Structures are given as C-alpha cells and as structure tokens.
C-alpha cells in the first residue's frame, strides 16, 4: 500500500507480450463498430510485438487527480468607500456560489453529467494600498445558505452569525482554508439538467434549478479608515473525495452566459479549436 501509494504504482498498465506470426482464420482486426461497442485489438494482435514489462501508473489519471486541484472560481472585489460607510449594498460583497462564473475549472467537470464531492476552500485576500498606509484590516467571510438574512448593507445583524459561519482573517495571519461536504441535497451535484421550474412557459430550465446552495457575503470589519484601499479576495476550490457517473464530450466552444450551454458570439460566426487543412493528402 505504502510503497504502491508512495511510489505511486497503484493502477498499473499491463505489459506488451511477445507475438509470432499468424496465418490464421480469425481476424481480430475486423469488428463492426456499428454495434456501438469498442474494439478490443492490441499491439500483440496486429504486429509481431516483443516483450516490454511496463511501469506506468494510471494513478494521475483518476477522477481525483483530474479533479482534486484548486481553481479560481471567483474574485470578490471591494473598492472601499469612507465617504458613505454602510449605505445600502456597499463595502460588503455577495456572490452566488457555484462555478460557471469562471472558465477552465468549469470546463473540466462538465466532462461528466453527474458528480459529487466534498469541497476544500482557500481564500487569498490581497490588500491593495491606494493610501499611504493600510495597517490592520480585519475581514469577515460569512457563508449563507438559502432562506437566510443576506446583509442589506455591511452592518446588518446578520453579521452576528449566531448560527452561521463566518471566517475571520487579519492582515498577517496565513490564508484561511476550510472544507465542506457534499452539500446539495440529493445524492450528487447536477452537472446539467433537462428540467424546468414548471409548466410556466416562462419557467427556468438548466443547471441552476438543482443548485442554489445559498450565497456567501463578505465584509471588511475594522470600520472606517483614513487611507483608502481596495480588496480582492480571490477564491480557489478543490474537490476532495470525488465521484463520477456518466461522462460526456468536452466543451469546445467558448461559453456564453453563466448557467446554460449556449454558444453564440457577437458575430464570431462562432468558433472552435479545429484547424483548417489545404489538403487531406499531406499533414
């Protein structure tokens, strides 16, 4: 286990045996792909192979090393104000949890229909000094599921978190990083959906119907200050203890809008990664 796990030799690939010639009836190279199945032909079948003892692991080819990597999924920003502190909808952020709002990572998952996993988080506040001195600036990142008082403005009463989670980070102390189960509700996270809100010819339809894991509100405590600032508390997300069912084709066209699959540029007659050839005859 150790060795196999430390040496990373858990999932090893078979070796290529030796072959000889075959002047025989059954032709393995011939199958009818229309059966929708996949051929099973190998080196040893087609050629006169040798003998190679392999030693490549398919460890890094696991839904956990494919998925289990932190990725920016959101960049909370706060261009502070000292003029009006508080006021309505100010100096405190509130973004809707769930990806899409960021590429790269979004594309990765989407490789599968369903999915499930405990999510590990990590914050990365970055205090830009627009003043001649910032000093001490406390921060409060408080998560909030659905039906919950979302702060109207900074100092509501919802920032008491009497029963909510609020992580605090003060300039100096390392980067906060917490985890989180598989939330949701049923069995796994809908990587898509072909359902709607209802029969209302004005109902919603997409992977935004089965995922509304509330919102997360920020807010920079410390109160009023002299020299201004602007913050950008980055967000990374990692999937630990992940699962997968049923795969699907990657996404070649640059996405559109949040949620949704839509493809459709502002003219860009549309565009994909495929390159053009002069002729099939020469590559």
């Amino acid at each position: 286990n150790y060795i196999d796990e430390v040496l990373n030799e858990v999932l090893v690939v078979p070796n290529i045996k030796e072959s000889h010639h075959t002047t025989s009836n059954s032709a393995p190279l011939l199958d009818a792909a229309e059966t929708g199945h996949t051929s099973n032909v190998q080196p040893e079948d087609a050629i006169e192979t040798r003998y190679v003892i392999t030693s490549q692991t398919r460890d890094e080819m696991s839904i956990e090393s494919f998925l289990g990597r932190s990725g920016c999924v959101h960049i909370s920003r706060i261009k502070v104000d000292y003029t009006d502190y508080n006021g309505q909808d100010i100096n405190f952020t509130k973004w809707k949890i769930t990806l899409q709002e960021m590429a790269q990572i979004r594309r990765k998952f989407e490789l599968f229909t369903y999915v499930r996993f405990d999510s590990e988080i990590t914050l990365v506040p970055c205090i830009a000094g627009r003043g001649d001195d910032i000093g001490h600036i406390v921060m409060q990142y408080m998560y909030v599921p659905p039906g919950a008082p979302i702060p109207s403005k900074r100092n509501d009463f919802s920032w008491q978190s009497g029963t909510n989670m609020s992580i605090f980070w003060q300039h100096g102390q390392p980067f906060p990083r917490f985890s989180i189960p598989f939330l949701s509700i049923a069995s796994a996270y809908y990587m898509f959906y072909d359902g709607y809100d209802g029969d209302n010819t004005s109902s919603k339809y997409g992977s935004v119907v089965t995922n509304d894991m509330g919102t997360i509100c920020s807010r920079i405590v410390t109160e009023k200050q002299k020299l201004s600032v602007v913050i950008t508390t980055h967000i990374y997300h990692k999937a630990k203890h992940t699962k997968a069912w049923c795969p699907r084709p990657p996404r070649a066209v640059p996405y559109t809008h949040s949620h949704v699959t839509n493809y459709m540029p502002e003219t860009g007659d549309v565009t994909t990664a495929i390159v053009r050839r002069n002729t099939i005859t020469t590559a």
């Binding site: 796990e5 858990v10 460890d59 696991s62 956990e64 985890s179 989180i180 189960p181 630990k240 203890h241």
Partner: peptide
C-alpha cells in the same frame, strides 16, 4: 505519518485513496 484526521468531520480530510 497518516490517518490522523485531526478534524472530527469526514468532509475534512485529505484527498481520498485509490483502490
């Protein structure tokens, strides 16, 4: 060094294993 789930909950733990 391992299996020392310093934290109570299971959701908090390292990247799972392989089998």
């Amino acid at each position: 060094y391992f299996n020392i789930n310093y934290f109570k909950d299971a959701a908090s733990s390292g990247a799972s294993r392989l089998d």
